[PDB]
mmCIF file of N, CA, C and O in Angstrom:
data_model
loop_
_atom_site.group_PDB
_atom_site.id
_atom_site.type_symbol
_atom_site.label_atom_id
_atom_site.label_comp_id
_atom_site.label_asym_id
_atom_site.label_seq_id
_atom_site.Cartn_x
_atom_site.Cartn_y
_atom_site.Cartn_z
ATOM 1 N N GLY A 1 64.668 -104.926 0.168
ATOM 2 C CA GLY A 1 64.323 -105.447 1.478
ATOM 3 C C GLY A 1 64.464 -106.954 1.558
ATOM 4 O O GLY A 1 65.058 -107.576 0.678
ATOM 5 N N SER A 2 63.916 -107.542 2.616
ATOM 6 C CA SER A 2 63.987 -108.986 2.811
ATOM 7 C C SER A 2 63.448 -109.726 1.591
ATOM 8 O O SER A 2 62.767 -109.142 0.748
ATOM 9 N N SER A 3 63.758 -111.015 1.503
ATOM 10 C CA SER A 3 63.309 -111.836 0.385
ATOM 11 C C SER A 3 62.434 -112.987 0.874
ATOM 12 O O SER A 3 62.486 -114.092 0.334
ATOM 13 N N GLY A 4 61.631 -112.719 1.898
ATOM 14 C CA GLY A 4 60.757 -113.741 2.443
ATOM 15 C C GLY A 4 59.354 -113.227 2.702
ATOM 16 O O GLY A 4 58.948 -113.063 3.852
ATOM 17 N N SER A 5 58.612 -112.969 1.629
ATOM 18 C CA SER A 5 57.250 -112.465 1.746
ATOM 19 C C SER A 5 56.274 -113.599 2.043
ATOM 20 O O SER A 5 55.796 -114.276 1.131
ATOM 21 N N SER A 6 55.983 -113.802 3.323
ATOM 22 C CA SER A 6 55.067 -114.857 3.741
ATOM 23 C C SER A 6 53.778 -114.266 4.303
ATOM 24 O O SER A 6 53.582 -113.051 4.293
ATOM 25 N N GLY A 7 52.899 -115.136 4.793
ATOM 26 C CA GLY A 7 51.639 -114.683 5.351
ATOM 27 C C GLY A 7 50.573 -115.760 5.325
ATOM 28 O O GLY A 7 50.435 -116.530 6.277
ATOM 29 N N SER A 8 49.815 -115.814 4.236
ATOM 30 C CA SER A 8 48.751 -116.801 4.091
ATOM 31 C C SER A 8 49.292 -118.100 3.503
ATOM 32 O O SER A 8 50.158 -118.086 2.629
ATOM 33 N N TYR A 9 48.775 -119.223 3.991
ATOM 34 C CA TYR A 9 49.207 -120.532 3.517
ATOM 35 C C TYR A 9 49.292 -120.559 1.994
ATOM 36 O O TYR A 9 50.344 -120.855 1.425
ATOM 37 N N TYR A 10 48.179 -120.247 1.340
ATOM 38 C CA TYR A 10 48.127 -120.236 -0.117
ATOM 39 C C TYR A 10 49.408 -119.652 -0.704
ATOM 40 O O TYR A 10 49.867 -120.076 -1.766
ATOM 41 N N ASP A 11 49.980 -118.677 -0.006
ATOM 42 C CA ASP A 11 51.210 -118.036 -0.456
ATOM 43 C C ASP A 11 52.419 -118.924 -0.182
ATOM 44 O O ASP A 11 53.238 -119.166 -1.069
ATOM 45 N N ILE A 12 52.525 -119.406 1.052
ATOM 46 C CA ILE A 12 53.634 -120.267 1.443
ATOM 47 C C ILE A 12 53.699 -121.512 0.565
ATOM 48 O O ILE A 12 54.782 -121.979 0.209
ATOM 49 N N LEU A 13 52.533 -122.044 0.216
ATOM 50 C CA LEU A 13 52.456 -123.235 -0.623
ATOM 51 C C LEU A 13 52.483 -122.862 -2.101
ATOM 52 O O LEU A 13 53.060 -123.574 -2.922
ATOM 53 N N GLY A 14 51.856 -121.738 -2.435
ATOM 54 C CA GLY A 14 51.822 -121.288 -3.814
ATOM 55 C C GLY A 14 50.616 -121.814 -4.566
ATOM 56 O O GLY A 14 50.684 -122.060 -5.770
ATOM 57 N N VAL A 15 49.507 -121.989 -3.854
ATOM 58 C CA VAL A 15 48.280 -122.490 -4.461
ATOM 59 C C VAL A 15 47.180 -121.435 -4.429
ATOM 60 O O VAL A 15 47.148 -120.562 -3.561
ATOM 61 N N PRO A 16 46.254 -121.514 -5.396
ATOM 62 C CA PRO A 16 45.135 -120.574 -5.499
ATOM 63 C C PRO A 16 44.118 -120.758 -4.378
ATOM 64 O O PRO A 16 44.110 -121.782 -3.694
ATOM 65 N N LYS A 17 43.262 -119.759 -4.192
ATOM 66 C CA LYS A 17 42.239 -119.810 -3.155
ATOM 67 C C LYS A 17 41.231 -120.919 -3.437
ATOM 68 O O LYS A 17 40.578 -121.425 -2.525
ATOM 69 N N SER A 18 41.113 -121.296 -4.707
ATOM 70 C CA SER A 18 40.183 -122.344 -5.109
ATOM 71 C C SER A 18 40.934 -123.606 -5.524
ATOM 72 O O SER A 18 40.385 -124.472 -6.204
ATOM 73 N N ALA A 19 42.192 -123.702 -5.109
ATOM 74 C CA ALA A 19 43.019 -124.858 -5.435
ATOM 75 C C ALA A 19 42.366 -126.151 -4.960
ATOM 76 O O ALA A 19 41.898 -126.241 -3.824
ATOM 77 N N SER A 20 42.335 -127.150 -5.836
ATOM 78 C CA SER A 20 41.736 -128.437 -5.506
ATOM 79 C C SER A 20 42.630 -129.225 -4.555
ATOM 80 O O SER A 20 43.854 -129.109 -4.597
ATOM 81 N N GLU A 21 42.007 -130.029 -3.697
ATOM 82 C CA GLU A 21 42.746 -130.836 -2.734
ATOM 83 C C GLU A 21 44.001 -131.428 -3.368
ATOM 84 O O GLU A 21 45.076 -131.416 -2.770
ATOM 85 N N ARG A 22 43.854 -131.945 -4.584
ATOM 86 C CA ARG A 22 44.975 -132.542 -5.301
ATOM 87 C C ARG A 22 46.045 -131.498 -5.604
ATOM 88 O O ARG A 22 47.240 -131.792 -5.570
ATOM 89 N N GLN A 23 45.608 -130.279 -5.901
ATOM 90 C CA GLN A 23 46.528 -129.191 -6.212
ATOM 91 C C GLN A 23 47.311 -128.769 -4.973
ATOM 92 O O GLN A 23 48.529 -128.597 -5.026
ATOM 93 N N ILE A 24 46.604 -128.606 -3.860
ATOM 94 C CA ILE A 24 47.234 -128.205 -2.608
ATOM 95 C C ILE A 24 48.354 -129.165 -2.224
ATOM 96 O O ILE A 24 49.519 -128.778 -2.147
ATOM 97 N N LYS A 25 47.993 -130.422 -1.984
ATOM 98 C CA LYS A 25 48.967 -131.441 -1.611
ATOM 99 C C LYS A 25 50.067 -131.551 -2.661
ATOM 100 O O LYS A 25 51.237 -131.753 -2.332
ATOM 101 N N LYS A 26 49.687 -131.418 -3.927
ATOM 102 C CA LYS A 26 50.641 -131.500 -5.027
ATOM 103 C C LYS A 26 51.706 -130.415 -4.905
ATOM 104 O O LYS A 26 52.903 -130.701 -4.952
ATOM 105 N N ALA A 27 51.265 -129.173 -4.746
ATOM 106 C CA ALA A 27 52.180 -128.047 -4.614
ATOM 107 C C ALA A 27 53.041 -128.183 -3.363
ATOM 108 O O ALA A 27 54.267 -128.092 -3.426
ATOM 109 N N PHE A 28 52.391 -128.403 -2.224
ATOM 110 C CA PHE A 28 53.097 -128.550 -0.956
ATOM 111 C C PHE A 28 54.206 -129.591 -1.070
ATOM 112 O O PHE A 28 55.387 -129.275 -0.926
ATOM 113 N N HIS A 29 53.818 -130.836 -1.329
ATOM 114 C CA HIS A 29 54.779 -131.924 -1.463
ATOM 115 C C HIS A 29 56.074 -131.432 -2.099
ATOM 116 O O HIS A 29 57.134 -131.454 -1.474
ATOM 117 N N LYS A 30 55.982 -130.986 -3.348
ATOM 118 C CA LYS A 30 57.145 -130.486 -4.070
ATOM 119 C C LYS A 30 57.960 -129.535 -3.199
ATOM 120 O O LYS A 30 59.179 -129.673 -3.084
ATOM 121 N N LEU A 31 57.280 -128.572 -2.586
ATOM 122 C CA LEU A 31 57.940 -127.599 -1.724
ATOM 123 C C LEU A 31 58.681 -128.295 -0.586
ATOM 124 O O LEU A 31 59.905 -128.216 -0.489
ATOM 125 N N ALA A 32 57.930 -128.977 0.272
ATOM 126 C CA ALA A 32 58.516 -129.690 1.401
ATOM 127 C C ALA A 32 59.860 -130.305 1.024
ATOM 128 O O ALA A 32 60.785 -130.342 1.834
ATOM 129 N N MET A 33 59.958 -130.789 -0.210
ATOM 130 C CA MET A 33 61.189 -131.403 -0.693
ATOM 131 C C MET A 33 62.305 -130.369 -0.805
ATOM 132 O O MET A 33 63.440 -130.620 -0.401
ATOM 133 N N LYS A 34 61.975 -129.205 -1.354
ATOM 134 C CA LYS A 34 62.948 -128.131 -1.517
ATOM 135 C C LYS A 34 63.375 -127.573 -0.162
ATOM 136 O O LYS A 34 64.453 -126.994 -0.031
ATOM 137 N N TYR A 35 62.523 -127.753 0.841
ATOM 138 C CA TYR A 35 62.812 -127.266 2.184
ATOM 139 C C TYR A 35 62.913 -128.423 3.172
ATOM 140 O O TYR A 35 62.858 -128.225 4.387
ATOM 141 N N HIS A 36 63.062 -129.634 2.644
ATOM 142 C CA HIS A 36 63.172 -130.825 3.479
ATOM 143 C C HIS A 36 64.514 -130.857 4.204
ATOM 144 O O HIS A 36 65.559 -130.533 3.641
ATOM 145 N N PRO A 37 64.486 -131.257 5.484
ATOM 146 C CA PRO A 37 65.691 -131.341 6.314
ATOM 147 C C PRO A 37 66.616 -132.472 5.879
ATOM 148 O O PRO A 37 67.828 -132.412 6.092
ATOM 149 N N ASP A 38 66.039 -133.502 5.270
ATOM 150 C CA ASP A 38 66.813 -134.646 4.803
ATOM 151 C C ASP A 38 67.656 -134.273 3.588
ATOM 152 O O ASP A 38 68.737 -134.823 3.376
ATOM 153 N N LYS A 39 67.154 -133.337 2.790
ATOM 154 C CA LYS A 39 67.860 -132.889 1.595
ATOM 155 C C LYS A 39 68.527 -131.539 1.832
ATOM 156 O O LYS A 39 69.739 -131.399 1.676
ATOM 157 N N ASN A 40 67.727 -130.546 2.210
ATOM 158 C CA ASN A 40 68.242 -129.207 2.469
ATOM 159 C C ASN A 40 69.300 -129.233 3.568
ATOM 160 O O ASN A 40 69.083 -129.799 4.640
ATOM 161 N N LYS A 41 70.444 -128.616 3.294
ATOM 162 C CA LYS A 41 71.536 -128.566 4.259
ATOM 163 C C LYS A 41 71.400 -127.353 5.174
ATOM 164 O O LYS A 41 71.562 -127.458 6.389
ATOM 165 N N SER A 42 71.097 -126.202 4.581
ATOM 166 C CA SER A 42 70.941 -124.968 5.341
ATOM 167 C C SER A 42 70.066 -125.195 6.570
ATOM 168 O O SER A 42 69.104 -125.963 6.546
ATOM 169 N N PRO A 43 70.406 -124.511 7.672
ATOM 170 C CA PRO A 43 69.664 -124.620 8.933
ATOM 171 C C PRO A 43 68.281 -123.986 8.848
ATOM 172 O O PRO A 43 67.352 -124.403 9.542
ATOM 173 N N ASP A 44 68.148 -122.977 7.993
ATOM 174 C CA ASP A 44 66.876 -122.287 7.816
ATOM 175 C C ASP A 44 65.825 -123.226 7.233
ATOM 176 O O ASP A 44 64.647 -123.147 7.581
ATOM 177 N N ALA A 45 66.259 -124.113 6.344
ATOM 178 C CA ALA A 45 65.355 -125.067 5.713
ATOM 179 C C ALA A 45 64.419 -125.697 6.740
ATOM 180 O O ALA A 45 63.198 -125.597 6.622
ATOM 181 N N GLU A 46 65.000 -126.345 7.744
ATOM 182 C CA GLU A 46 64.216 -126.993 8.789
ATOM 183 C C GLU A 46 63.100 -126.075 9.279
ATOM 184 O O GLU A 46 61.950 -126.494 9.410
ATOM 185 N N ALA A 47 63.449 -124.822 9.549
ATOM 186 C CA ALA A 47 62.477 -123.844 10.023
ATOM 187 C C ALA A 47 61.423 -123.557 8.959
ATOM 188 O O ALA A 47 60.223 -123.620 9.227
ATOM 189 N N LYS A 48 61.877 -123.240 7.753
ATOM 190 C CA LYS A 48 60.974 -122.943 6.647
ATOM 191 C C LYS A 48 59.896 -124.015 6.523
ATOM 192 O O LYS A 48 58.705 -123.710 6.483
ATOM 193 N N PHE A 49 60.323 -125.272 6.462
ATOM 194 C CA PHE A 49 59.394 -126.390 6.344
ATOM 195 C C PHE A 49 58.361 -126.360 7.465
ATOM 196 O O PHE A 49 57.248 -126.867 7.312
ATOM 197 N N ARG A 50 58.736 -125.763 8.592
ATOM 198 C CA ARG A 50 57.843 -125.670 9.740
ATOM 199 C C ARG A 50 56.625 -124.810 9.412
ATOM 200 O O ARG A 50 55.600 -124.885 10.090
ATOM 201 N N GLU A 51 56.745 -123.995 8.369
ATOM 202 C CA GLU A 51 55.655 -123.120 7.953
ATOM 203 C C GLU A 51 54.901 -123.718 6.768
ATOM 204 O O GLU A 51 53.696 -123.513 6.620
ATOM 205 N N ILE A 52 55.619 -124.456 5.929
ATOM 206 C CA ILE A 52 55.019 -125.083 4.758
ATOM 207 C C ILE A 52 54.061 -126.199 5.162
ATOM 208 O O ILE A 52 52.949 -126.294 4.645
ATOM 209 N N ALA A 53 54.502 -127.041 6.091
ATOM 210 C CA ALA A 53 53.683 -128.148 6.569
ATOM 211 C C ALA A 53 52.391 -127.642 7.201
ATOM 212 O O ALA A 53 51.301 -127.879 6.682
ATOM 213 N N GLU A 54 52.522 -126.947 8.327
ATOM 214 C CA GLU A 54 51.364 -126.410 9.030
ATOM 215 C C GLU A 54 50.360 -125.809 8.050
ATOM 216 O O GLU A 54 49.150 -125.943 8.224
ATOM 217 N N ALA A 55 50.875 -125.146 7.019
ATOM 218 C CA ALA A 55 50.025 -124.527 6.010
ATOM 219 C C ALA A 55 49.218 -125.576 5.252
ATOM 220 O O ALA A 55 48.044 -125.367 4.945
ATOM 221 N N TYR A 56 49.855 -126.702 4.952
ATOM 222 C CA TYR A 56 49.197 -127.783 4.227
ATOM 223 C C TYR A 56 48.153 -128.469 5.103
ATOM 224 O O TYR A 56 46.988 -128.581 4.725
ATOM 225 N N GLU A 57 48.582 -128.926 6.275
ATOM 226 C CA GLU A 57 47.685 -129.603 7.204
ATOM 227 C C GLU A 57 46.283 -129.004 7.140
ATOM 228 O O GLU A 57 45.290 -129.726 7.050
ATOM 229 N N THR A 58 46.209 -127.677 7.189
ATOM 230 C CA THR A 58 44.930 -126.980 7.139
ATOM 231 C C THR A 58 44.276 -127.132 5.771
ATOM 232 O O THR A 58 43.099 -127.479 5.670
ATOM 233 N N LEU A 59 45.044 -126.868 4.720
ATOM 234 C CA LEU A 59 44.539 -126.976 3.356
ATOM 235 C C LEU A 59 44.567 -128.423 2.877
ATOM 236 O O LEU A 59 44.399 -128.699 1.689
ATOM 237 N N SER A 60 44.779 -129.346 3.811
ATOM 238 C CA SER A 60 44.831 -130.766 3.484
ATOM 239 C C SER A 60 43.471 -131.424 3.702
ATOM 240 O O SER A 60 42.980 -132.159 2.846
ATOM 241 N N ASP A 61 42.870 -131.155 4.855
ATOM 242 C CA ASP A 61 41.567 -131.718 5.188
ATOM 243 C C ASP A 61 40.447 -130.936 4.510
ATOM 244 O O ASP A 61 40.700 -130.027 3.720
ATOM 245 N N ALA A 62 39.206 -131.297 4.823
ATOM 246 C CA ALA A 62 38.048 -130.628 4.245
ATOM 247 C C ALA A 62 37.585 -129.472 5.125
ATOM 248 O O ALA A 62 37.675 -128.309 4.736
ATOM 249 N N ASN A 63 37.088 -129.801 6.313
ATOM 250 C CA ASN A 63 36.609 -128.790 7.249
ATOM 251 C C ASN A 63 37.710 -127.784 7.572
ATOM 252 O O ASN A 63 37.475 -126.576 7.588
ATOM 253 N N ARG A 64 38.912 -128.291 7.828
ATOM 254 C CA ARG A 64 40.048 -127.438 8.151
ATOM 255 C C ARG A 64 40.254 -126.376 7.076
ATOM 256 O O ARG A 64 40.415 -125.194 7.379
ATOM 257 N N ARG A 65 40.249 -126.807 5.818
ATOM 258 C CA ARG A 65 40.437 -125.893 4.697
ATOM 259 C C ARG A 65 39.195 -125.034 4.482
ATOM 260 O O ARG A 65 39.289 -123.884 4.052
ATOM 261 N N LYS A 66 38.031 -125.599 4.783
ATOM 262 C CA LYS A 66 36.769 -124.886 4.624
ATOM 263 C C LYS A 66 36.704 -123.680 5.556
ATOM 264 O O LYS A 66 36.194 -122.624 5.184
ATOM 265 N N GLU A 67 37.227 -123.845 6.767
ATOM 266 C CA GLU A 67 37.227 -122.769 7.751
ATOM 267 C C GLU A 67 38.247 -121.696 7.382
ATOM 268 O O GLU A 67 37.942 -120.502 7.397
ATOM 269 N N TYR A 68 39.459 -122.128 7.051
ATOM 270 C CA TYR A 68 40.525 -121.206 6.681
ATOM 271 C C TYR A 68 40.155 -120.420 5.427
ATOM 272 O O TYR A 68 40.851 -119.481 5.041
ATOM 273 N N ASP A 69 39.053 -120.812 4.795
ATOM 274 C CA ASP A 69 38.588 -120.144 3.585
ATOM 275 C C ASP A 69 37.345 -119.307 3.870
ATOM 276 O O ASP A 69 37.082 -118.314 3.191
ATOM 277 N N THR A 70 36.582 -119.714 4.879
ATOM 278 C CA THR A 70 35.366 -119.003 5.253
ATOM 279 C C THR A 70 35.651 -117.942 6.308
ATOM 280 O O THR A 70 34.892 -116.985 6.462
ATOM 281 N N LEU A 71 36.751 -118.116 7.034
ATOM 282 C CA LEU A 71 37.139 -117.171 8.075
ATOM 283 C C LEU A 71 38.290 -116.287 7.608
ATOM 284 O O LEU A 71 38.251 -115.067 7.761
ATOM 285 N N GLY A 72 39.315 -116.912 7.035
ATOM 286 C CA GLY A 72 40.462 -116.166 6.552
ATOM 287 C C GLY A 72 41.741 -116.536 7.276
ATOM 288 O O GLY A 72 41.740 -117.403 8.149
ATOM 289 N N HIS A 73 42.838 -115.878 6.911
ATOM 290 C CA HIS A 73 44.131 -116.144 7.532
ATOM 291 C C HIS A 73 44.151 -115.652 8.976
ATOM 292 O O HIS A 73 44.235 -116.448 9.912
ATOM 293 N N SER A 74 44.074 -114.337 9.149
ATOM 294 C CA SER A 74 44.088 -113.739 10.480
ATOM 295 C C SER A 74 42.820 -114.095 11.249
ATOM 296 O O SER A 74 42.816 -114.130 12.479
ATOM 297 N N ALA A 75 41.744 -114.357 10.514
ATOM 298 C CA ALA A 75 40.469 -114.712 11.125
ATOM 299 C C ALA A 75 40.516 -116.117 11.716
ATOM 300 O O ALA A 75 40.259 -116.310 12.904
ATOM 301 N N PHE A 76 40.845 -117.095 10.879
ATOM 302 C CA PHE A 76 40.923 -118.483 11.317
ATOM 303 C C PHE A 76 41.996 -118.655 12.388
ATOM 304 O O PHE A 76 41.912 -119.550 13.231
ATOM 305 N N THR A 77 43.008 -117.793 12.348
ATOM 306 C CA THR A 77 44.099 -117.849 13.312
ATOM 307 C C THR A 77 43.833 -116.931 14.498
ATOM 308 O O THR A 77 44.688 -116.134 14.883
ATOM 309 N N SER A 78 42.641 -117.047 15.076
ATOM 310 C CA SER A 78 42.261 -116.224 16.218
ATOM 311 C C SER A 78 41.796 -117.093 17.383
ATOM 312 O O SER A 78 40.602 -117.341 17.550
ATOM 313 N N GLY A 79 42.749 -117.553 18.188
ATOM 314 C CA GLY A 79 42.419 -118.390 19.327
ATOM 315 C C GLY A 79 43.055 -117.897 20.612
ATOM 316 O O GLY A 79 42.758 -116.796 21.078
ATOM 317 N N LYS A 80 43.931 -118.713 21.187
ATOM 318 C CA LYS A 80 44.610 -118.355 22.426
ATOM 319 C C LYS A 80 46.059 -117.956 22.158
ATOM 320 O O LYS A 80 46.971 -118.772 22.286
ATOM 321 N N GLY A 81 46.261 -116.697 21.785
ATOM 322 C CA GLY A 81 47.601 -116.212 21.504
ATOM 323 C C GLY A 81 47.598 -114.837 20.866
ATOM 324 O O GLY A 81 46.544 -114.224 20.703
ATOM 325 N N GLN A 82 48.782 -114.353 20.503
ATOM 326 C CA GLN A 82 48.912 -113.041 19.880
ATOM 327 C C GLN A 82 48.468 -113.084 18.422
ATOM 328 O O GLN A 82 49.028 -113.824 17.614
ATOM 329 N N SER A 83 47.456 -112.287 18.093
ATOM 330 C CA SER A 83 46.935 -112.237 16.733
ATOM 331 C C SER A 83 47.271 -110.905 16.070
ATOM 332 O O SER A 83 47.978 -110.076 16.640
ATOM 333 N N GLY A 84 46.759 -110.707 14.859
ATOM 334 C CA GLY A 84 47.015 -109.474 14.137
ATOM 335 C C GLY A 84 45.777 -108.611 14.004
ATOM 336 O O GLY A 84 45.080 -108.639 12.990
ATOM 337 N N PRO A 85 45.486 -107.823 15.050
ATOM 338 C CA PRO A 85 44.320 -106.934 15.071
ATOM 339 C C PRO A 85 44.468 -105.764 14.105
ATOM 340 O O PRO A 85 43.552 -104.956 13.950
ATOM 341 N N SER A 86 45.625 -105.678 13.457
ATOM 342 C CA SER A 86 45.892 -104.604 12.508
ATOM 343 C C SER A 86 44.673 -104.337 11.631
ATOM 344 O O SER A 86 44.058 -105.266 11.105
ATOM 345 N N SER A 87 44.329 -103.062 11.478
ATOM 346 C CA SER A 87 43.180 -102.673 10.669
ATOM 347 C C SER A 87 43.376 -103.085 9.213
ATOM 348 O O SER A 87 42.542 -103.780 8.635
ATOM 349 N N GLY A 88 44.488 -102.651 8.627
ATOM 350 C CA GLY A 88 44.775 -102.984 7.243
ATOM 351 C C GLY A 88 45.866 -102.115 6.651
ATOM 352 O O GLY A 88 45.624 -101.354 5.715
#
């Protein structure tokens, strides 16, 4: 099947649920580079990075990351838009 198993930030970035602030930014940074538009030529890169960044922003701050950890992926991502009510 496809080769793009995404979902939770921790996955997109590749950091543990208890990853330290330094670990999160550390992992992301490296990634952003591999998917950076300035380096990456492929058109998909630009898009991919669009998911890596947003993922970090949340796991970058304190409260932001605290919520995404106390609520969850689909939980924290429940505002004004289409969510994933899927049971499991």
